[PDB]
Design a protein around this ligand. Structure first.
Ligand code: LXY
Ligand code: LXY
Lengths: 252, 115, 43
């Protein structure tokens, strides 16, 4: 609510928005800042789930420090872009408690770990193309530096190579310095990484998600049993005796 | 067309995958909303992210693996039109990993498994 | 999905074929110096 009511990049305080200072949302901005601040100081006291909660609470404070301490507008929103992101990314890790959500977070945990084991190997398959296109295409803006070259050759892997804009239009103007080798590397990329690696990742993804679905009808219930028994280990016994129930009726 | 043997099984396969995709949004819309509200901060000076709704429609449309990388990350960076450059490329790769690769392969895992 | 049928064996088959290739090519006295008959673990 504190994001969508303020233009990103404007400094703000409980008194409103700075450009000039204006008051048109002041009670909403004041209350949302106090609520985020309270949620963050209580968040530390309740202290990858354990790591994201530090990234949220150490940064959602900085997005709201202007409730007390004036801060550079750039640092306020650079923290806002991190805090606003991790609040929602980490909301999925609260959805695991619901019966019908949690299995999709199990399938996300499984495929993400499977991709990370596959990354320890294939970063060197990226860096081969990233440093090779840095030599072969150096006269072009997207490959101007080795870091931008490796970012661009990462972003090409989805099968969006910008072929006309960086191989063929440059070739028909002699702007390729090494034309035969530059097209030979364009094919070697198009084989190895939007085809061979992405079809390998679909092989891993299907192979291991179709193995979560082999257990899912039990995994749902195992997550519920482990949740409810963890709460029986942490609720006080008099409350369990007052609240739990030896028999129940149903009316279909 | 469900009443012809030549057709009905492909509509069973459509009913089965569409219902599976629907259960999956009740989790992963809160993944989209992270990227949509984050790119609204990081790319705000650009027409195609100008408002939170247009930013969430854009991050929805990028999902398929067409990020418009040169047109809204690189060409802005090489003109200093990115306000938060080090974080803006870190959110580009976070999207590229989590969605065109992780979610869009997770859905092939579901679809191939069910069909 | 067929390599993933054998993977839990193929890891070990690759390790055994690597270590036996080195055990054939390290000189015999070196194995007798190094290849200790028992090991302890402290969990
Ligand atoms: C493992 C392979 C897959 F087949 C496809 C791809 C991927 O989606 N991996 C996920 C990932 C990426 C990065 C990353 C960060 N930052 C950069 C940099 F430097 F460019 F900015 N690059 C990569 N970090 C962590 C992860 C992980 F956590 F998910 F594992 N990779 S790959 O090796 O990158 C890659 C391979 C070929 C290619 F042609 C281009 C890239
Ligand atoms: C469940 C995931 C999948 F992995 C991929 C994707 C999808 O294809 N879902 C189908 C769907 C979409 C919408 C929808 C409507 N309107 C908007 C809005 F607001 F942008 F306009 N967004 C979404 N409604 C209903 C359905 C359903 F009926 F099929 F279930 N979604 S995702 O959560 O949207 C999404 C995830 C990540 C991301 F980076 C971008 C988007």
């Amino acid at each position: 609510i504190l994001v969508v009511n303020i233009k990103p990049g404007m400094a703000f305080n409980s008194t409103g928005i700075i450009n000039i200072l204006d008051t048109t949302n002041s009670y909403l901005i004041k209350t949302c800042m106090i609520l985020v601040f309270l949620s963050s100081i209580f968040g530390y006291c309740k202290e990858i789930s354990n790591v994201l909660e530090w990234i949220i609470y150490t940064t959602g404070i900085i997005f709201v420090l202007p409730l007390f301490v004036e801060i550079p507008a750039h640092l306020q929103w650079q923290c806002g872009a991190i805090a606003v992101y991790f609040y929602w990314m980490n909301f999925l890790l609260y959805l695991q408690r619901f019966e019908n959500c949690g299995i999709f977070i199990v399938m996300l945990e499984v495929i993400l770990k499977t991709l990370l084991r596959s990354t320890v190997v294939f970063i060197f398959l990226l860096l081969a193309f990233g440093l090779s296109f840095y030599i072969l295409l150096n006269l072009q803006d997207p490959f101007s530096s080795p870091l931008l070259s490796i970012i661009q050759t990462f972003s090409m892997m989805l099968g969006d190579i910008n072929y006309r804009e960086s191989f063929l239009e440059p070739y028909l103007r002699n702007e390729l310095a090494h034309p035969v080798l530059s097209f030979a590397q364009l094919v070697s990329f198009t084989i190895f990484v939007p085809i061979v690696l992405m079809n390998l990742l679909i092989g891993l993804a299907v192979g291991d998600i179709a193995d979560v679905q082999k257990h899912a009808s039990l995994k749902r219930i195992a997550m519920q049993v482990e949740l409810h028994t963890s709460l029986e280990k942490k609720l006080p016994l008099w409350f369990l005796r007052k609240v739990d129930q030896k028999s129940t009726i149903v009316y279909p």
